[PDB]
Design a protein around this nucleic acid. Sequence first.
RNA 1: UAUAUAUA
Length: 167
Amino acid sequence: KESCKMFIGGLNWDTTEDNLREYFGKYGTVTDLKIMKDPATGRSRGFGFLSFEKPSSVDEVVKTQHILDGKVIDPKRAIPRDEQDKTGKIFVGGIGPDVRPKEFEEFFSQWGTIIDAQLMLDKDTGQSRGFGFVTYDSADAVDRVCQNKFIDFKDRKIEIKRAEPRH
RNA sequence: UAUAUAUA
């Protein structure tokens, strides 16, 4: 059920749920998949929720990076809406070479558990450097950094601002 | 310094 639900992101708009299930079919059988198509706007969300009848598939799903239709995705465990609401996403800048995405997650962890943190790098053409994306289990953690606009990370201070629309 | 992730 929902407990076995997985979150899929970084999916090619052309990507279809059928390919999704087929892609993750190797792992087993999917009980409920949600690529999150957008027949209205005409463009899919680009991410979906994948569920498996057997939770075992989920364990293996995270082990692999996952490359679908020439794109890269990061399948992660689904987060309950109530818990999801508590969490938030902030924007960070001042990220460069030697930053290491792993260090980025541990770096921000100092002021928050950090449910998830990434450099985006959808195409690995630049998002990986320059700025970063961090998610916090609690909104309160975000406030800590708000007070701390500049943090000593790579010994060059970074500027952090609450998440904003792509505009 | 920007999300084809958190589904209106």
